[PDB]
Amino acid sequence: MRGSHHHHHHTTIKIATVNRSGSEEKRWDKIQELVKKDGITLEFTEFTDYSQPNKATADGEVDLNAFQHYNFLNNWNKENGKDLVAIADTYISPIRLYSGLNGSANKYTKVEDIPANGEIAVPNDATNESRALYLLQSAGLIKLDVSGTALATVANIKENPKNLKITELDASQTARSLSSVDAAVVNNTFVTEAKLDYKKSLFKEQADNSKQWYNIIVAKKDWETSPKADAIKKVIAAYHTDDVKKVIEESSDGLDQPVW
Numbered sequence: 001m002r003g004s005h006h007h008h009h010h011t012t013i014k015i016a017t018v019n020r021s022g023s024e025e026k027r028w029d030k031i032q033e034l035v036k037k038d039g040i041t042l043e044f045t046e047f048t049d050y051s052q053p054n055k056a057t058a059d060g061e062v063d064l065n066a067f068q069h070y071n072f073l074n075n076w077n078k079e080n081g082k083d084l085v086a087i088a089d090t091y092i093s094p095i096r097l098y099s100g101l102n103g104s105a106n107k108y109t110k111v112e113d114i115p116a117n118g119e120i121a122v123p124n125d126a127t128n129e130s131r132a133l134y135l136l137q138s139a140g141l142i143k144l145d146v147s148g149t150a151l152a153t154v155a156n157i158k159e160n161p162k163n164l165k166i167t168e169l170d171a172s173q174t175a176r177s178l179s180s181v182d183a184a185v186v187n188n189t190f191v192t193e194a195k196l197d198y199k200k201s202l203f204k205e206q207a208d209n210s211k212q213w214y215n216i217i218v219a220k221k222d223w224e225t226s227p228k229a230d231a232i233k234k235v236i237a238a239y240h241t242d243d244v245k246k247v248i249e250e251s252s253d254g255l256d257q258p259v260w
Protein backbone atom coordinates (compact mmCIF):
# COMPACT_ATOMS: atom_id res chain seq x y z
CA MET A 1 0.00 0.00 0.00
CA ARG A 2 1.11 3.53 -0.99
CA GLY A 3 2.81 6.17 1.14
CA SER A 4 4.52 4.00 3.76
CA HIS A 5 6.37 6.26 6.18
CA HIS A 6 7.25 7.03 9.76
CA HIS A 7 7.78 10.17 11.81
CA HIS A 8 10.85 11.49 13.53
CA HIS A 9 9.90 14.34 15.99
CA HIS A 10 12.32 16.53 17.80
CA THR A 11 7.53 27.46 15.88
CA THR A 12 7.49 23.97 14.43
CA ILE A 13 8.65 23.33 10.82
CA LYS A 14 7.49 20.03 9.27
CA ILE A 15 9.75 18.58 6.57
CA ALA A 16 9.04 15.57 4.25
CA THR A 17 11.99 13.42 3.25
CA VAL A 18 12.69 9.94 2.03
CA ASN A 19 14.28 7.67 4.72
CA ARG A 20 18.05 7.03 4.48
CA SER A 21 20.26 4.66 6.55
CA GLY A 22 23.30 4.95 8.81
CA SER A 23 24.51 8.39 9.55
CA GLU A 24 23.02 10.10 6.43
CA GLU A 25 20.32 12.02 8.34
CA LYS A 26 22.76 13.59 10.83
CA ARG A 27 22.61 16.85 8.84
CA TRP A 28 19.15 17.32 10.33
CA ASP A 29 20.35 16.89 13.92
CA LYS A 30 23.05 19.48 13.27
CA ILE A 31 20.47 21.90 11.72
CA GLN A 32 18.19 21.37 14.75
CA GLU A 33 21.10 22.18 17.10
CA LEU A 34 21.70 25.42 15.09
CA VAL A 35 18.10 26.71 15.13
CA LYS A 36 17.33 25.64 18.74
CA LYS A 37 18.21 29.06 20.17
CA ASP A 38 15.79 30.48 17.59
CA GLY A 39 12.88 28.51 19.13
CA ILE A 40 12.42 26.26 16.02
CA THR A 41 11.48 22.57 16.34
CA LEU A 42 11.92 20.41 13.25
CA GLU A 43 9.59 17.39 12.69
CA PHE A 44 10.12 14.95 9.83
CA THR A 45 7.72 12.79 7.81
CA GLU A 46 10.16 10.17 6.28
CA PHE A 47 8.53 8.45 3.30
CA THR A 48 9.94 5.30 1.68
CA ASP A 49 9.73 6.31 -1.99
CA TYR A 50 9.75 9.35 -4.27
CA SER A 51 6.01 9.40 -5.08
CA GLN A 52 4.78 10.98 -1.78
CA PRO A 53 6.76 14.04 -0.47
CA ASN A 54 5.70 16.60 -3.13
CA LYS A 55 2.04 15.59 -2.63
CA ALA A 56 2.47 16.07 1.18
CA THR A 57 3.81 19.56 0.46
CA ALA A 58 1.16 20.66 -2.09
CA ASP A 59 -1.52 19.33 0.34
CA GLY A 60 -0.13 21.33 3.29
CA GLU A 61 0.71 18.27 5.48
CA VAL A 62 4.35 19.53 5.67
CA ASP A 63 6.09 22.91 5.26
CA LEU A 64 9.19 21.81 3.22
CA ASN A 65 10.49 18.76 1.46
CA ALA A 66 14.04 17.71 0.97
CA PHE A 67 14.48 14.66 -1.26
CA GLN A 68 14.54 15.46 -5.01
CA HIS A 69 16.61 17.09 -7.80
CA TYR A 70 15.47 19.98 -10.06
CA ASN A 71 14.51 17.64 -12.94
CA PHE A 72 12.33 15.47 -10.73
CA LEU A 73 10.62 18.64 -9.35
CA ASN A 74 10.04 20.24 -12.79
CA ASN A 75 8.61 16.99 -14.08
CA TRP A 76 6.37 16.46 -11.01
CA ASN A 77 5.02 20.03 -11.25
CA LYS A 78 4.22 19.58 -14.99
CA GLU A 79 2.57 16.17 -14.51
CA ASN A 80 0.46 17.27 -11.55
CA GLY A 81 -0.21 20.87 -12.71
CA LYS A 82 1.42 22.29 -9.53
CA ASP A 83 4.06 24.96 -8.96
CA LEU A 84 6.20 24.05 -5.88
CA VAL A 85 9.47 25.99 -5.93
CA ALA A 86 13.10 25.34 -5.00
CA ILE A 87 14.31 27.77 -2.24
CA ALA A 88 17.87 26.30 -1.75
CA ASP A 89 20.25 23.82 -3.45
CA THR A 90 21.68 21.08 -1.20
CA TYR A 91 23.90 18.43 -2.70
CA ILE A 92 24.61 16.39 -5.86
CA SER A 93 25.15 12.65 -5.85
CA PRO A 94 25.95 11.42 -9.41
CA ILE A 95 23.93 8.22 -9.93
CA ARG A 96 25.84 4.93 -10.18
CA LEU A 97 25.56 1.54 -11.75
CA TYR A 98 26.18 -1.35 -9.30
CA SER A 99 27.02 -4.99 -9.91
CA GLY A 100 24.51 -7.69 -9.07
CA LEU A 101 25.48 -9.73 -6.01
CA ASN A 102 26.32 -13.41 -5.40
CA GLY A 103 25.74 -13.50 -1.66
CA SER A 104 27.79 -10.46 -0.67
CA ALA A 105 30.36 -10.70 -3.49
CA ASN A 106 29.94 -8.50 -6.61
CA LYS A 107 29.35 -10.69 -9.69
CA TYR A 108 31.23 -8.22 -11.92
CA THR A 109 34.05 -5.80 -11.46
CA LYS A 110 33.79 -4.28 -15.01
CA VAL A 111 30.93 -3.19 -17.35
CA GLU A 112 32.41 -5.35 -20.16
CA ASP A 113 31.74 -8.46 -18.01
CA ILE A 114 27.95 -7.96 -17.87
CA PRO A 115 26.74 -11.02 -19.78
CA ALA A 116 24.83 -11.20 -22.99
CA ASN A 117 21.10 -11.69 -22.17
CA GLY A 118 21.76 -10.04 -18.75
CA GLU A 119 19.17 -7.97 -16.90
CA ILE A 120 19.72 -4.43 -15.69
CA ALA A 121 17.23 -2.73 -13.30
CA VAL A 122 16.64 1.03 -13.56
CA PRO A 123 14.27 3.47 -11.78
CA ASN A 124 10.86 3.83 -13.43
CA ASP A 125 9.98 7.53 -12.74
CA ALA A 126 10.52 9.63 -15.93
CA THR A 127 13.58 11.70 -14.85
CA ASN A 128 15.58 8.99 -13.03
CA GLU A 129 14.62 6.42 -15.69
CA SER A 130 15.99 8.80 -18.33
CA ARG A 131 19.07 9.49 -16.21
CA ALA A 132 19.76 5.78 -15.84
CA LEU A 133 19.39 5.18 -19.62
CA TYR A 134 21.79 7.97 -20.55
CA LEU A 135 24.14 6.41 -17.95
CA LEU A 136 23.87 3.01 -19.58
CA GLN A 137 24.61 4.69 -22.91
CA SER A 138 27.68 6.58 -21.64
CA ALA A 139 28.87 3.19 -20.12
CA GLY A 140 28.78 1.87 -23.70
CA LEU A 141 26.03 -0.71 -23.13
CA ILE A 142 23.27 0.84 -25.35
CA LYS A 143 22.60 3.69 -27.74
CA LEU A 144 19.51 5.86 -27.57
CA ASP A 145 17.56 7.64 -30.36
CA VAL A 146 17.09 10.77 -28.28
CA SER A 147 19.65 13.16 -26.95
CA GLY A 148 20.13 16.56 -25.39
CA THR A 149 17.36 17.38 -22.94
CA ALA A 150 15.00 14.74 -24.36
CA LEU A 151 13.76 12.35 -21.65
CA ALA A 152 14.82 8.81 -22.64
CA THR A 153 12.50 5.87 -22.02
CA VAL A 154 13.18 2.20 -22.63
CA ALA A 155 11.36 2.54 -26.01
CA ASN A 156 14.22 4.90 -27.06
CA ILE A 157 16.87 2.22 -27.00
CA LYS A 158 18.28 2.13 -30.62
CA GLU A 159 21.14 -0.45 -30.16
CA ASN A 160 21.46 -3.21 -27.55
CA PRO A 161 24.56 -5.32 -28.47
CA LYS A 162 24.39 -7.68 -25.46
CA ASN A 163 20.57 -8.07 -25.75
CA LEU A 164 20.18 -6.84 -22.13
CA LYS A 165 16.74 -6.92 -20.55
CA ILE A 166 16.13 -3.45 -19.12
CA THR A 167 13.67 -3.74 -16.27
CA GLU A 168 12.26 -0.59 -14.73
CA LEU A 169 11.39 -0.77 -11.05
CA ASP A 170 10.43 1.74 -8.36
CA ALA A 171 13.57 3.81 -7.59
CA SER A 172 13.28 2.57 -3.98
CA GLN A 173 13.52 -1.09 -5.22
CA THR A 174 16.52 -1.04 -7.60
CA ALA A 175 19.14 -1.64 -4.88
CA ARG A 176 17.10 -4.51 -3.39
CA SER A 177 16.94 -6.12 -6.86
CA LEU A 178 20.74 -6.62 -6.95
CA SER A 179 20.44 -10.02 -5.35
CA SER A 180 18.69 -11.22 -8.52
CA VAL A 181 19.82 -9.10 -11.51
CA ASP A 182 23.13 -8.54 -13.30
CA ALA A 183 23.39 -4.79 -12.53
CA ALA A 184 21.10 -1.90 -11.29
CA VAL A 185 21.12 1.88 -11.44
CA VAL A 186 20.62 3.09 -7.88
CA ASN A 187 19.90 6.60 -6.51
CA ASN A 188 22.05 7.66 -3.47
CA THR A 189 18.89 7.67 -1.33
CA PHE A 190 18.71 3.78 -1.26
CA VAL A 191 22.38 2.86 -1.29
CA THR A 192 23.01 2.56 2.50
CA GLU A 193 19.82 0.62 3.32
CA ALA A 194 20.94 -2.09 0.85
CA LYS A 195 24.42 -1.97 2.39
CA LEU A 196 26.10 -0.97 -0.91
CA ASP A 197 29.51 0.62 -1.20
CA TYR A 198 29.16 3.46 -3.74
CA LYS A 199 32.91 3.52 -4.24
CA LYS A 200 32.73 -0.10 -5.63
CA SER A 201 30.20 0.76 -8.35
CA LEU A 202 30.74 -0.36 -11.95
CA PHE A 203 30.05 3.12 -13.41
CA LYS A 204 29.42 6.68 -12.30
CA GLU A 205 27.36 9.35 -14.10
CA GLN A 206 29.64 11.83 -15.90
CA ALA A 207 29.62 15.61 -14.97
CA ASP A 208 28.92 18.25 -17.63
CA ASN A 209 24.27 20.54 -17.41
CA SER A 210 24.99 18.88 -13.97
CA LYS A 211 22.79 21.49 -12.08
CA GLN A 212 19.64 19.62 -13.24
CA TRP A 213 20.68 16.79 -10.83
CA TYR A 214 21.24 19.22 -7.90
CA ASN A 215 19.04 18.35 -4.88
CA ILE A 216 16.89 21.13 -3.44
CA ILE A 217 14.69 22.25 -0.58
CA VAL A 218 11.16 22.81 -1.80
CA ALA A 219 8.07 24.69 -0.57
CA LYS A 220 4.70 25.85 -1.96
CA LYS A 221 5.00 28.96 -4.13
CA ASP A 222 3.21 31.16 -1.51
CA TRP A 223 5.47 30.07 1.43
CA GLU A 224 6.87 33.64 1.71
CA THR A 225 3.52 35.00 2.87
CA SER A 226 3.25 32.18 5.40
CA PRO A 227 3.53 32.87 9.16
CA LYS A 228 6.43 30.32 9.09
CA ALA A 229 8.47 32.19 6.43
CA ASP A 230 10.90 33.70 8.99
CA ALA A 231 11.54 30.20 10.51
CA ILE A 232 12.01 28.67 7.05
CA LYS A 233 14.65 31.30 6.19
CA LYS A 234 16.57 30.37 9.38
CA VAL A 235 16.44 26.66 8.53
CA ILE A 236 17.90 27.44 5.13
CA ALA A 237 20.60 29.54 6.78
CA ALA A 238 21.43 26.60 9.06
CA TYR A 239 21.59 24.11 6.12
CA HIS A 240 23.97 26.46 4.27
CA THR A 241 26.68 26.48 6.98
CA ASP A 242 30.23 25.25 6.93
CA ASP A 243 29.21 23.01 9.84
CA VAL A 244 26.48 21.28 7.84
CA LYS A 245 28.72 21.09 4.76
CA LYS A 246 31.19 19.04 6.85
CA VAL A 247 28.50 16.90 8.46
CA ILE A 248 27.09 15.95 5.02
CA GLU A 249 30.52 14.94 3.70
CA GLU A 250 31.43 13.03 6.84
CA SER A 251 28.04 11.34 7.61
CA SER A 252 27.58 10.21 3.93
CA ASP A 253 31.30 9.21 3.50
CA GLY A 254 31.48 11.52 0.44
CA LEU A 255 28.37 9.99 -1.31
CA ASP A 256 26.62 13.41 -1.11
CA GLN A 257 28.49 16.42 -2.46
CA PRO A 258 27.32 19.83 -1.09
CA VAL A 259 26.85 22.48 -3.81
CA TRP A 260 26.68 25.87 -1.90
Ligand code: MET
Nearest residue numbers: 050067068069072187188
Ligand atom coordinates in the same frame (compact mmCIF):
# COMPACT_ATOMS: atom_id res chain seq x y z
C1 MET B 1 13.60 12.20 -6.24
S1 MET B 1 14.81 12.66 -7.49
C2 MET B 1 16.26 11.71 -6.95
C3 MET B 1 17.01 12.45 -5.81
C4 MET B 1 18.25 11.68 -5.32
N1 MET B 1 18.72 12.21 -3.99
C5 MET B 1 19.38 11.87 -6.33
O1 MET B 1 20.09 12.91 -6.26
O2 MET B 1 19.63 10.97 -7.17
Ligand SMILES: [Cl-]
Nearest residue numbers: 010028029032
Ligand atom coordinates in the same frame (compact mmCIF):
# COMPACT_ATOMS: atom_id res chain seq x y z
CL1 LIG C 1 18.11 16.20 17.42
Ligand SMILES: [Zn+2]
Nearest residue numbers: 005006007045
Ligand atom coordinates in the same frame (compact mmCIF):
# COMPACT_ATOMS: atom_id res chain seq x y z
ZN1 LIG D 1 2.16 10.21 9.05
Ligand SMILES: [Zn+2]
Nearest residue numbers: 007043044045
Ligand atom coordinates in the same frame (compact mmCIF):
# COMPACT_ATOMS: atom_id res chain seq x y z
ZN1 LIG E 1 5.24 13.90 12.15
Ligand SMILES: [Zn+2]
Nearest residue numbers: 006007008046
Ligand atom coordinates in the same frame (compact mmCIF):
# COMPACT_ATOMS: atom_id res chain seq x y z
ZN1 LIG F 1 13.50 7.17 11.76
Ligand SMILES: [Zn+2]
Nearest residue numbers: 019020025046
Ligand atom coordinates in the same frame (compact mmCIF):
# COMPACT_ATOMS: atom_id res chain seq x y z
ZN1 LIG G 1 15.30 8.44 9.10
Ligand SMILES: [Zn+2]
Nearest residue numbers: 025026028029
Ligand atom coordinates in the same frame (compact mmCIF):
# COMPACT_ATOMS: atom_id res chain seq x y z
ZN1 LIG H 1 18.93 12.13 13.58
Ligand SMILES: [Zn+2]
Nearest residue numbers: 008010028029
Ligand atom coordinates in the same frame (compact mmCIF):
# COMPACT_ATOMS: atom_id res chain seq x y z
ZN1 LIG I 1 16.73 13.72 14.67
Ligand SMILES: [Zn+2]
Nearest residue numbers: 059060061062
Ligand atom coordinates in the same frame (compact mmCIF):
# COMPACT_ATOMS: atom_id res chain seq x y z
ZN1 LIG J 1 -2.96 15.89 7.95
Ligand SMILES: [Zn+2]
Nearest residue numbers: 056059060061
Ligand atom coordinates in the same frame (compact mmCIF):
# COMPACT_ATOMS: atom_id res chain seq x y z
ZN1 LIG K 1 -4.72 16.01 5.30
Ligand SMILES: [Zn+2]
Nearest residue numbers: 124125129168
Ligand atom coordinates in the same frame (compact mmCIF):
# COMPACT_ATOMS: atom_id res chain seq x y z
ZN1 LIG L 1 8.85 4.56 -16.29
Ligand SMILES: [Zn+2]
Nearest residue numbers: 129153154168
Ligand atom coordinates in the same frame (compact mmCIF):
# COMPACT_ATOMS: atom_id res chain seq x y z
ZN1 LIG M 1 9.74 3.51 -19.00
Ligand SMILES: [Zn+2]
Nearest residue numbers: 197198199200
Ligand atom coordinates in the same frame (compact mmCIF):
# COMPACT_ATOMS: atom_id res chain seq x y z
ZN1 LIG N 1 34.42 1.41 0.29
